[PDB]
Design an enzyme around this catalytic site. Structure first.
Site, PDB file in Angstrom:
ATOM      1  N   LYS A 173       3.378  22.132 -12.270  1.00 21.05           N
ATOM      2  CA  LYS A 173       4.057  21.520 -11.135  1.00 21.05           C
ATOM      3  C   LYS A 173       5.548  21.259 -11.331  1.00 21.05           C
ATOM      4  CE  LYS A 173       0.264  20.962  -8.557  1.00 21.05           C
ATOM      5  NZ  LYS A 173      -0.530  22.148  -8.176  1.00 21.05           N
ATOM      6  N   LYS A 223       9.930  24.538  -8.253  1.00 24.09           N
ATOM      7  CA  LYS A 223       9.186  25.553  -8.994  1.00 24.09           C
ATOM      8  C   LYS A 223       9.863  26.923  -8.954  1.00 24.09           C
ATOM      9  CE  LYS A 223       5.264  22.974  -7.522  1.00 24.09           C
ATOM     10  NZ  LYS A 223       4.393  22.833  -6.326  1.00 24.09           N
ATOM     11  N   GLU A 252       1.230  29.742  -2.323  1.00 19.91           N
ATOM     12  CA  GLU A 252       0.871  30.268  -1.004  1.00 19.91           C
ATOM     13  C   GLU A 252       1.691  29.437  -0.020  1.00 19.91           C
ATOM     14  OE1 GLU A 252      -3.277  30.075   0.126  1.00 19.91           O
ATOM     15  OE2 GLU A 252      -3.645  32.046  -0.749  1.00 19.91           O
TER      16      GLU A 252
HETATM   17  C1  LIG Z   1      -3.431  31.931  -4.024  1.00 24.27           C
HETATM   18  C2  LIG Z   1      -3.069  30.531  -4.518  1.00 24.27           C
HETATM   19  C3  LIG Z   1      -2.175  29.728  -3.884  1.00 24.27           C
HETATM   20  C4  LIG Z   1      -1.766  28.415  -4.377  1.00 24.27           C
HETATM   21  N1  LIG Z   1      -0.763  27.723  -3.752  1.00 24.27           N
HETATM   22  C5  LIG Z   1      -0.251  26.651  -4.361  1.00 24.27           C
HETATM   23  C6  LIG Z   1       0.987  26.023  -3.869  1.00 24.27           C
HETATM   24  O1  LIG Z   1       1.601  26.414  -2.860  1.00 24.27           O
HETATM   25  N2  LIG Z   1       1.457  24.984  -4.614  1.00 24.27           N
HETATM   26  C7  LIG Z   1       0.834  24.461  -5.801  1.00 24.27           C
HETATM   27  O2  LIG Z   1       1.395  23.561  -6.379  1.00 24.27           O
HETATM   28  N3  LIG Z   1      -0.349  25.006  -6.217  1.00 24.27           N
HETATM   29  C8  LIG Z   1      -0.862  26.063  -5.590  1.00 24.27           C
HETATM   30  N4  LIG Z   1      -1.981  26.697  -6.096  1.00 24.27           N
HETATM   31  C9  LIG Z   1      -2.621  26.092  -7.278  1.00 24.27           C
HETATM   32  C10 LIG Z   1      -4.047  25.619  -7.019  1.00 24.27           C
HETATM   33  O3  LIG Z   1      -4.122  24.311  -6.439  1.00 24.27           O
HETATM   34  C11 LIG Z   1      -4.796  25.649  -8.367  1.00 24.27           C
HETATM   35  O4  LIG Z   1      -5.039  27.048  -8.682  1.00 24.27           O
HETATM   36  C12 LIG Z   1      -6.112  24.912  -8.397  1.00 24.27           C
HETATM   37  O5  LIG Z   1      -5.904  23.496  -8.170  1.00 24.27           O
HETATM   38  C13 LIG Z   1      -6.883  25.054  -9.691  1.00 24.27           C
HETATM   39  O6  LIG Z   1      -6.097  24.524 -10.774  1.00 24.27           O
HETATM   40  P1  LIG Z   1      -5.608  25.405 -11.991  1.00 24.27           P
HETATM   41  O7  LIG Z   1      -4.834  26.572 -11.483  1.00 24.27           O
HETATM   42  O8  LIG Z   1      -4.826  24.493 -12.887  1.00 24.27           O
HETATM   43  O9  LIG Z   1      -6.928  25.850 -12.686  1.00 24.27           O
HETATM   44  C14 LIG Z   1      -2.437  27.945  -5.578  1.00 24.27           C
HETATM   45  C15 LIG Z   1      -3.419  28.759  -6.173  1.00 24.27           C
HETATM   46  C16 LIG Z   1      -3.726  30.035  -5.742  1.00 24.27           C
HETATM   47  C17 LIG Z   1      -4.680  30.875  -6.523  1.00 24.27           C
END
Ligand SMILES: Cc1cc2nc3c(=O)[nH]c(=O)nc-3n(C[C@H](O)[C@H](O)[C@H](O)COP(=O)(O)O)c2cc1C
Ligand SMILES: Cc1cc2nc3c(=O)[nH]c(=O)nc-3n(C[C@H](O)[C@H](O)[C@H](O)COP(=O)(O)O)c2cc1C
Ligand SMILES: O=CC(=O)CNC(=O)c1cc(N(CCBr)CCBr)c([N+](=O)[O-])cc1[N+](=O)[O-]
Lengths: 216, 216
Positions: free
Chosen positions: B13, B73, B164
């Site tokens: 983050k 980010k 996303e």
């Molecule tokens: C396609 C996709 C879009 C995401 N979009 C965001 C986003 O805009 N901002 C963010 O902080 N996290 C984003 N995430 C992170 C997800 O919240 C995160 O993958 C999920 O909470 C699982 O945690 P981890 O990746 O630490 O295992 C995204 C994840 C994916 C796969």
């Protein structure tokens, strides 16, 4: 090294029926499916892991029509996983995700729990009401899981092949999906390759970075 | 080894702007983008890799509106990758894919080059002429690339976050992707986290296997 794994991996055209996955690898395959990231940790998926020959024969029924050349891969491989996506995002699933994130200790204060559920719903409603593509957004997350999986199993020392060449409607009817709120998207047979694999000796082909990439 | 990576990796983050990727890691992430698999080796993608302060500012413009929480980010990360998908699968692009497979040495006979082209067109036509979900099928492959990339960069000792949460319209226009035949789908900042990344110390949370997995 992971780049070596990315350059040496391939889409296996034929598996060895005798070479089965060890109980350790069988467990590790399930860990990769579960721990893959997704948008807002929505995890809009279901997995069917066929390890028995009777279960593999049930999955192989989707490639019985014009997709015959994909049938042998689904039966000779040790473990065969079918990737399923949610048909619609319910408020119960959004509740199941945040309650699980709370049980695991991701929130210090209950206000932070509400802030996460609000942000998840903001993204989920934008796809349900505004853009009208919740089914495609959830299927995109499952495809991200496939990407994570293929690299993970190649790095485990296992051979795999992603299959889009199957009749999804036949696979849905064989496992009772749709009624349960799921749809089959990809089928990934995992195991070890044989000498009949006309892809392991062949070089890897990709378009050059001058066409597909720009640096700014 | 990768099970350890899959269980330890997280969505950062907050990044550290002084912590850059080593020259080799910068080339390795580009290899990971290209050597990713796709249905029929179609590779319906394009990548914008921002590594300069000016290049990252151009990407960060899309983190406006209700997406302001993603601006840091995109600016503080060492390298920022924008995953783009083709808007329409043209015949000139399917030709580029088979000709590249012919120059790499995948076909022994010209009968083998005509057999793969037919097999590519069978799938390509099913999506652009019958089902009409061409943009969605190509977008799915791009998401597959992201999954491969996330676990890939995590195994390289790098931190990343898939995004996303951005305005696709702003990003597309900034790089003029529409006229080139592309659309931005996912933005992935790559680098190293800072001490202000609360997600680095927080436990990973996922739904239990008794809800998402069925063994047959
Ligand atoms: C396609 C996709 C879009 C995401 N979009 C965001 C986003 O805009 N901002 C963010 O902080 N996290 C984003 N995430 C992170 C997800 O919240 C995160 O993958 C999920 O909470 C699982 O945690 P981890 O990746 O630490 O295992 C995204 C994840 C994916 C796969
Ligand atoms: C989503 C997806 C669907 C695929 N479907 C099939 C299929 O039905 N049959 C098959 O033999 N290969 C299939 N493949 C394998 C591709 O042809 C292969 O990944 C591509 O040619 C690149 O080769 P590689 O995997 O050796 O790098 C699929 C790949 C992906 C990612
Ligand atoms: O990558 C180029 C080639 O080496 C092989 N391409 C495929 O992986 C590939 C190959 C096929 N065929 C060819 C029709 Br005779 C079956 C023989 Br395996 C098909 N198919 O038509 O189902 C799809 C893909 N597909 O990827 O969907």
């Amino acid at each position: 090294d992971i780049i070596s794994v990315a350059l040496k991996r391939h889409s296996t055209k034929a598996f060895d029926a005798s070479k089965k996955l060890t109980p350790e690898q069988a467990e590790q395959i399930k860990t990769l499916l579960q721990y893959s990231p997704s948008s807002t940790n929505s995890q809009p998926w279901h997995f069917i892991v066929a390890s028995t020959e009777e279960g593999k024969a049930r999955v192989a029924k989707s490639a019985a029509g014009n997709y015959v050349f994909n049938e042998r891969k689904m039966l000779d491989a040790s473990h065969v996983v079918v990737f399923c996506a949610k048909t619609a995002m319910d408020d119960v699933w959004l509740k199941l995700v945040v309650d699980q994130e709370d049980a695991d200790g991701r929130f210090a204060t209950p206000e932070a729990k509400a802030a996460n559920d609000k942000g998840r719903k903001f993204f989920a409603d934008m796809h349900r009401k505004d853009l009208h593509d919740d089914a495609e957004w959830m299927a995109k997350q499952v495809y991200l899981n496939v990407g994570n999986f293929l690299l993970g199993v190649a790095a485990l020392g296992l051979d795999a092949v992603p299959i889009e060449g199957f009749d999804a409607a036949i696979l849905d009817a064989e496992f009772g999906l749709k009624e349960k709120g799921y749809t089959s998207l990809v089928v990934v047979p995992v195991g070890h390759h044989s000498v009949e694999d006309f892809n392991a000796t062949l070089p890897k082909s990709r378009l050059p970075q001058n066409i597909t990439l720009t640096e700014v």
